[PDB]
Amino acid sequence: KNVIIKWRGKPIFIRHRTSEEIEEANEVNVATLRDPQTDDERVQKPEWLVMIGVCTHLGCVPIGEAGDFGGWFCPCHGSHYDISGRIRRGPAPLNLEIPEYDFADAETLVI
Amino acid sequence: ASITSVVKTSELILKSPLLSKIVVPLAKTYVKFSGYRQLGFKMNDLIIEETPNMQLALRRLPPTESYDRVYRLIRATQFSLSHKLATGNDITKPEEDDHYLIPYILDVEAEAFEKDALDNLEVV
Amino acid sequence: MALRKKNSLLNMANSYVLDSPQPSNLNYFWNFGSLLALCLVIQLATGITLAMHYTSHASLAFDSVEHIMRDVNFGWFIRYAHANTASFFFICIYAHMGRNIYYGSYKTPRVLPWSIGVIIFLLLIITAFMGYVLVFGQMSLWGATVICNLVSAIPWLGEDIVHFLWGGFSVGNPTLQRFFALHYLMPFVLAVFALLHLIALHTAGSSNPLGITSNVDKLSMHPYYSFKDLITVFAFLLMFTLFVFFSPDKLGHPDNYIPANPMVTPASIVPEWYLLPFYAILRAIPDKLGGVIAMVAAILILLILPIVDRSIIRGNAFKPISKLLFGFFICNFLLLGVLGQVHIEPPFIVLGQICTIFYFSYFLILLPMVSTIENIFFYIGSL
Amino acid sequence: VLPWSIGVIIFLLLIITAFMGYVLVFGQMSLWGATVICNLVSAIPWLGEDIVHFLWGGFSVGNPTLQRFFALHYLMPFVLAVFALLHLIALHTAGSSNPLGITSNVDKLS
Amino acid sequence: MALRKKNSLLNMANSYVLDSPQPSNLNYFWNFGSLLALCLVIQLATGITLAMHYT
Amino acid sequence: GKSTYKIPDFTPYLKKDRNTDANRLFSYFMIGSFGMLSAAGAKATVQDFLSNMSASADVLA
Amino acid sequence: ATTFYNVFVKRNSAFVATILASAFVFDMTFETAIDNFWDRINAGKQWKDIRHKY
Amino acid sequence: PDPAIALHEAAAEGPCHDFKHHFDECVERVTKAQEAEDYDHAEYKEDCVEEFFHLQHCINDNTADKLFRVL
Amino acid sequence: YMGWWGHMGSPPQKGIAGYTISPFAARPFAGVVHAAIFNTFRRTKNQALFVILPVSFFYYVWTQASEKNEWLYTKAGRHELAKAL
Amino acid sequence: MTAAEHGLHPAEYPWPQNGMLSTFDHASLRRGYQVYKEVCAACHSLDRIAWRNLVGVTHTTDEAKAFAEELEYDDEPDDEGNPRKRPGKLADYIPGPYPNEQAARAANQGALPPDLSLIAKARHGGADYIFALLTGYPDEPPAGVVLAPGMNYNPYFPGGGIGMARTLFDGVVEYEDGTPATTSQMAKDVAAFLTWAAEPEHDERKKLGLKAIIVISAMLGLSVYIKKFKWSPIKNRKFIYNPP
Amino acid sequence: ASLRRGYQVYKEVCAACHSLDRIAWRNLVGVTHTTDEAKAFAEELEYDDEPDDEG
Ligand code: HEC
Ligand code: HEM
Ligand code: HEM
Ligand code: HEM
Ligand code: HEM
Numbered sequence A: 001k002n003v004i005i006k007w008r009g010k011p012i013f014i015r016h017r018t019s020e021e022i023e024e025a026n027e028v029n030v031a032t033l034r035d036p037q038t039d040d041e042r043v044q045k046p047e048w049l050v051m052i053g054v055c056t057h058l059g060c061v062p063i064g065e066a067g068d069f070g071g072w073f074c075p076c077h078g079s080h081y082d083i084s085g086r087i088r089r090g091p092a093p094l095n096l097e098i099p100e101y102d103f104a105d106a107e108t109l110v111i
Numbered sequence B: 001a002s003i004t005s006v007v008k009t010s011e012l013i014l015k016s017p018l019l020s021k022i023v024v025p026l027a028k029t030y031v032k033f034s035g036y037r038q039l040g041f042k043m044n045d046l047i048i049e050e051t052p053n054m055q056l057a058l059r060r061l062p063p064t065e066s067y068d069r070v071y072r073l074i075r076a077t078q079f080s081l082s083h084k085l086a087t088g089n090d091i092t093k094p095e096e097d098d099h100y101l102i103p104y105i106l107d108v109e110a111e112a113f114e115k116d117a118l119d120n121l122e123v124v
Numbered sequence C: 001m002a003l004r005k006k007n008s009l010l011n012m013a014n015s016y017v018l019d020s021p022q023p024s025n026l027n028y029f030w031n032f033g034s035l036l037a038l039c040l041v042i043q044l045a046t047g048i049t050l051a052m053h054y055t056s057h058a059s060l061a062f063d064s065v066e067h068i069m070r071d072v073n074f075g076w077f078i079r080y081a082h083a084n085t086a087s088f089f090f091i092c093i094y095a096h097m098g099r100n101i102y103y104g105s106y107k108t109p110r111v112l113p114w115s116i117g118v119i120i121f122l123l124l125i126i127t128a129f130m131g132y133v134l135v136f137g138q139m140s141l142w143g144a145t146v147i148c149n150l151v152s153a154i155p156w157l158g159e160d161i162v163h164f165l166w167g168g169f170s171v172g173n174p175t176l177q178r179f180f181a182l183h184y185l186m187p188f189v190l191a192v193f194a195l196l197h198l199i200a201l202h203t204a205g206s207s208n209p210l211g212i213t214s215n216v217d218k219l220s221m222h223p224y225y226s227f228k229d230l231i232t233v234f235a236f237l238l239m240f241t242l243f244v245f246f247s248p249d250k251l252g253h254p255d256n257y258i259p260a261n262p263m264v265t266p267a268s269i270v271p272e273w274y275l276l277p278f279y280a281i282l283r284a285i286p287d288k289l290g291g292v293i294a295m296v297a298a299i300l301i302l303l304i305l306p307i308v309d310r311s312i313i314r315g316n317a318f319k320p321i322s323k324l325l326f327g328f329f330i331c332n333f334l335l336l337g338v339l340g341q342v343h344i345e346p347p348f349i350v351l352g353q354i355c356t357i358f359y360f361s362y363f364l365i366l367l368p369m370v371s372t373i374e375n376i377f378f379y380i381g382s383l
Numbered sequence D: 001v002l003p004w005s006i007g008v009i010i011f012l013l014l015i016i017t018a019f020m021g022y023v024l025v026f027g028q029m030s031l032w033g034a035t036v037i038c039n040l041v042s043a044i045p046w047l048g049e050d051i052v053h054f055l056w057g058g059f060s061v062g063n064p065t066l067q068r069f070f071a072l073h074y075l076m077p078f079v080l081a082v083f084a085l086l087h088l089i090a091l092h093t094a095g096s097s098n099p100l101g102i103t104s105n106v107d108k109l110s
Numbered sequence E: 001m002a003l004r005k006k007n008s009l010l011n012m013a014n015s016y017v018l019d020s021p022q023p024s025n026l027n028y029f030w031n032f033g034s035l036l037a038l039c040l041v042i043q044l045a046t047g048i049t050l051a052m053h054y055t
Numbered sequence F: 001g002k003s004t005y006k007i008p009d010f011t012p013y014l015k016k017d018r019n020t021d022a023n024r025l026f027s028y029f030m031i032g033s034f035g036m037l038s039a040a041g042a043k044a045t046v047q048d049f050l051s052n053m054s055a056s057a058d059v060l061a
Numbered sequence G: 001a002t003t004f005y006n007v008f009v010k011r012n013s014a015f016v017a018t019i020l021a022s023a024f025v026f027d028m029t030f031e032t033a034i035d036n037f038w039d040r041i042n043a044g045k046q047w048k049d050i051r052h053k054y
Numbered sequence H: 001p002d003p004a005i006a007l008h009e010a011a012a013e014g015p016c017h018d019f020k021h022h023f024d025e026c027v028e029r030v031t032k033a034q035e036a037e038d039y040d041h042a043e044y045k046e047d048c049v050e051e052f053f054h055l056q057h058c059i060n061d062n063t064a065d066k067l068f069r070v071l
Numbered sequence I: 001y002m003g004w005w006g007h008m009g010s011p012p013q014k015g016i017a018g019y020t021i022s023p024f025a026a027r028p029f030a031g032v033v034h035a036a037i038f039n040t041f042r043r044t045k046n047q048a049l050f051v052i053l054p055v056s057f058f059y060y061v062w063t064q065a066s067e068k069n070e071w072l073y074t075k076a077g078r079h080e081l082a083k084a085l
Numbered sequence J: 001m002t003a004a005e006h007g008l009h010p011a012e013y014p015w016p017q018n019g020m021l022s023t024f025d026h027a028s029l030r031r032g033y034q035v036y037k038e039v040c041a042a043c044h045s046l047d048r049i050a051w052r053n054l055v056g057v058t059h060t061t062d063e064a065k066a067f068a069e070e071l072e073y074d075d076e077p078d079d080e081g082n083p084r085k086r087p088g089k090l091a092d093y094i095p096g097p098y099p100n101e102q103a104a105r106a107a108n109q110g111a112l113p114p115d116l117s118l119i120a121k122a123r124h125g126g127a128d129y130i131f132a133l134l135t136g137y138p139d140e141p142p143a144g145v146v147l148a149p150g151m152n153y154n155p156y157f158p159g160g161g162i163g164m165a166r167t168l169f170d171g172v173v174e175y176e177d178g179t180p181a182t183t184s185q186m187a188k189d190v191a192a193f194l195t196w197a198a199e200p201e202h203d204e205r206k207k208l209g210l211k212a213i214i215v216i217s218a219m220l221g222l223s224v225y226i227k228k229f230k231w232s233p234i235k236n237r238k239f240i241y242n243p244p
Numbered sequence K: 001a002s003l004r005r006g007y008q009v010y011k012e013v014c015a016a017c018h019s020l021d022r023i024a025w026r027n028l029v030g031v032t033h034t035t036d037e038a039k040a041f042a043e044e045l046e047y048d049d050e051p052d053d054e055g
């Protein structure tokens, strides 16, 4: 599941990623990525994808679970984000920004 | 810039035959296009005077030359505000465009530059 | 002795607006000074009036400007007058600076009025930028976001400074309230500097289009320049009228009539037209910090004109090569303006870089070369 | 006389400035102060009522009044600073008086 | 000639705050003028600051 | 060119009827028209501009 | 014509009074004249032209 | 019925005939290209927007004044 | 560098006689038609090159740049755009 | 950018109000309000316009009060502090179809219909853009355009895909004045109406500008005579120099 | 310690009729209560959120 938390007006996508989702994200060779990053750089905890859910192209909010890399699809110009929230296809230049988030408890994070 | 600089550089150019052959005709056309003669000015009337050196040089002008300069400036100011040009005898002919002020300012500056040099002398 | 000379207070007015001795041959380009004074007065009158109807809270700002347009008697006029006069202020200020560059008003003995002038020009930019934000439309927000994120390029402290100016982590209510206070204040500071540059000028008096002394032939400021200033006041008011009453939105950007939305980014963020040349200069440098420095340097480099102009003659009236160079400089400054509003696409990227190099090379290379050569041509040519 | 006379105007501007600033809080004293003080203007014959409504921007003290007092309270201190500077320029012709009331032209200190 | 006297701008500051000739015997009641200047500055500083937070 | 008592030629600009009241009156008609429009314009400007301070449409409602 | 000058122009108090009275008259008449002109060039367009239907 | 329909048709057959034919030929090419297999796995998919804009821009230039004259 | 009336800082003037007539004695618009036509023609002709040269050059530059830009973002210009990025 | 990405620029139509001396056609404004009320108001708000604004522009006071009185607005709470509704008055603003953005987007497949009070000033093109957009839906999108789901092709809208479907069809409105309600007629009327909504001072502003232009022109003419008059002693000055 | 006791009086007696509208839960933290105690007080109440996706 992916949650949408407003944080400074901007939406925050929080996905509770499954084991096989993590695996799917850890596949793509870093080499072939507009914005080259691995999931380990993005998440500080593999079960908590926390991103700023604003598309890096112009600034629409991607519809999650949709896409072609089954992560997030920006409907505006058709840019596809990953399960890491990395850009794969479409006009968007960068991967979906990661806020500064810390796990105060294992059951609560602050953003 | 200093008038001294302008004068020295000009003399270097006039010395070199090659340089003078190409520069002197240019400078003559430049002055024709400049069009200060069409307001009845002599070249030297255009030099910036709000400097201590230039004020001193103007004070050293012979009375006649000074009175004539004041007339040319007033006449030119009047043509400027009327948007007219000089006609007839008011136009400065090339032979009348004499460097009446250059000798005075070169003496003023010679002293001022000597003073600066000598302020920096070192007994060996 | 006449009261206007005897009484100390009256004497100060007298020395500036009545008995002030002026050259008798100032042309129409000497009238932009008084037009800039008129712009500054209109902006204070309309500005103070808008402040009586404006609410600086971000939940209400945009709505308060709609209230001004729709409900306040003549509010449309006061709003459009204020917005358009800001454009006219920059037309007049560019004209006035252009006049000063062409006629060598920056040379001794007028380096001080010129240098204070460069600061007036910076304050006007800051003032007009902050005023733009107060509407809190989309251009307001996205302008403040982008411009204040340039400050992030200041090393080490940049980020901290930005958050301090915004009063928070993004442009929001705190930013809007503080820009309102400062935008109210800055025009008063600008008026004080305008008055200082005049006091500084009073020692030498106005330059004139011939670049010679005017000490030989002076005319009282009144009535001659009083009545000459009225012609351009009425010419200005004709232009003002055409914009304010008949095309009030011609100089503006429609995006500012959409309320600020932090999510949606506008199609294109371009500044107000009068900032466009500096924006083009900034885009020309690929480095973020480099770009900011270049943009500020594009204004501060005017402070070196007194040094780099090596001419023994004041102004360009008599200098055909300098006039051509100045023509190219002014047209390049307009091309920079146009390049500030195109998209960052070929072939405008390289063109913008060439125009930026030309802009700086005027001050650093060409003006020193050309002014040196003209000195030599005047001397040889008149021998 | 001239520095003194300009000073009397500075004193009036200070009263107006401080009165408007008091209104900006919009507490009970703010409101009831603006109500009673601006209803004194109602005593001006013939036009008094009209002037009050014009200053309030309405038929009672409310939002329009508050917004306009904010703008003016911001501005008035700058006017007051200019007059303060004018009374000094006026004073400069005679210089300061002194506690003996005699000339000081004989014995000056920077 | 000293810069503070030569330069027109500096000269105005000079004539008011530095070389201004004053009587030698002003008592403490002549200090309210500068306190009123200080009040006016504090009111501008605090006032402009409040305006950045006031609606 | 030399005599200062030979006043330069001003005939291109001198009005023949220069000392008539008609002549002065005309120039004051121009000045006065200009004063009239400036007064009418200032009244219009002030009245329109200050009306912003009268109750706005929402208040009047 | 001397008479006109002497009465309305010679004293500045009279001249300024004449200018202000003229300004008053101009203001009033110009308002009325523009109103009529504006109504003729915008005929059948304004609310006053269609109001009669209601 | 809608005046615009007639005016647009008239302007397409008349002063904007070259642009009409351009757009038509474009459409023919694109439809044919879409008909062919392994079109979905192509790099560049051609549209007809450019030709459409040239046509519409032309039609509008020839119609604007005429249309507002009949309203 | 500038004084005031009475001591303006002119070098001493002597030998210049200045003459003028009253504004009421002059035709303010004397020879205005001649000036508006012939004088303005003269003054414009003399300054024409200093305006025409830079304006014509920068207009040509802009025209070429804007036409290239337009062409690059057409279908025909796809390939040249791809190389330019 | 591609012209697609910019949107086709709208034609310049000769609106009644174009022209320095031209007001809006108020009969068109009234017709345009009827289009807004019967078509646009389903999805779009007009939040900055009050019922009082229509009075003496499009409607008499009675007609506008009748429109206001048909609606219910939030009153001040009753004496037990329970919420209450009241009938609308002239000072009320025209109410929107949706309570908030989220409701608006949910009803419009994610797209948020903007408020139309300023739309004529908030888009390049103004009335021409609104007219072009409403009339510019082709029967078929140009071959090769891929529309996102819930998008409609419209060349005037930047990007081409707009979340608003074609809405004006011949006879969706029945005008009360017997004007044939063709797509083009309704778009012209509503575009005029929205232009008025964005700039309601337009008629007054241009009349005062006519007065300003005339007076300022006269003062400019006079100021030039006066300048020349006062300067004539300086322009006419002549010198005779005798070198001493 | 008196402030904390006073809050308990406010909460159990005055709050029945009187509001304390200008004080946020965060204001009690490090004055009368630890962050945990204050969050516990806040989390017991319901406040108006932004509308859901159906508005
Ligand atoms: C049932 C829905 C619906 C109706 C009916 C409707 N609209 Fe819209 N409109 C929308 C939606 C949704 C958008 C936003 C489209 C987008 O952002 O993709 C929109 C956008 C607009 C825009 C702005 C497009 C832009 O540039 O951002 C204008 C103008 C507009 N509508 C006017 C009208 C007018 C005028 C009418 C009818 C006379 C109308 N609409 C009828 C739903 C509607
Ligand atoms: C509010 C903005 C400004 C106002 C009101 C203003 C006003 C004036 C006035 C009234 C004058 C004398 C009359 C004239 O020459 O036009 C003047 C002269 C001057 N101004 Fe400005 N000015 C402003 C901004 C600037 C700026 C930005 C500069 C320089 C960058 C500048 C530099 C000068 C200089 C050098 C002079 C002397 C020119 C000369 O007479 O030769 N001023 N200004
Ligand atoms: C040099 C003087 C000034 C300049 C250049 C200037 C410029 C601007 C600009 C450009 C805007 C944006 C206008 C818009 O698009 O709506 C604006 C808005 C504003 N200005 Fe100024 N301004 C000046 C002086 C003042 C002053 C003295 C005040 C006094 C408070 C003021 C109050 C406002 C207010 C309240 C707004 C917001 C309302 C609005 O947008 O119209 N301004 N200003
Ligand atoms: C902002 C308010 C004011 C400021 C900042 C101010 C400042 C000053 C200063 C600095 C001086 C010279 C030093 C001194 O004698 O204390 C002075 C002198 C003076 N002030 Fe004020 N003043 C203000 C208000 C007033 C008022 C309200 C009046 C009169 C009602 C006034 C009348 C004078 C007079 C007459 C002098 C000359 C006194 C003398 O030296 O004998 N001032 N003021
Ligand atoms: C002579 C200078 C000034 C005086 C005598 C003055 C006086 C006052 C007074 C008496 C109040 C009521 C204070 C309260 O009880 O809370 C006040 C409030 C205010 N003043 Fe001033 N003021 C001055 C200058 C300024 C200036 C320059 C600003 C610039 C904006 C300003 C902004 C405010 C604001 C925003 C408030 C309301 C906030 C508040 O009440 O604290 N003041 N002022």
Ligand SMILES: CCCCCC[C@H]1C(=O)O[C@H](C)[C@H](NC(=O)c2cccc(NC=O)c2O)C(=O)O[C@@H](C)[C@@H]1OC(=O)CC(C)C
Pocket (backbone or CB within 6 Å): C012, C013, C014, C016, C017, C022, C026, C030, C031, C033, C034, C036, C037, C040, C190, C191, C192, C194, C195, C196, C198, C206, C221, C225, C226, C228, C229
């Ligand atoms: C009332 C006395 C207070 C002194 C300052 C007031 C103003 C003042 O000095 O006015 C003058 C009329 C001045 N013009 C000139 O110098 C001038 C000189 C030569 C030729 C022309 N034009 C040619 O035909 C001129 O236009 C001007 O407009 O400068 C303002 C900016 C001043 O405002 C200030 O600095 C204070 C503040 C409002 C900026």
Ligand code: FES
Pocket (backbone or CB within 6 Å): A055, A056, A057, A058, A059, A060, A074, A075, A076, A077, A078, A079, A090, A091, A092
């Ligand atoms: S805005 Fe996200 S795809 Fe273009």
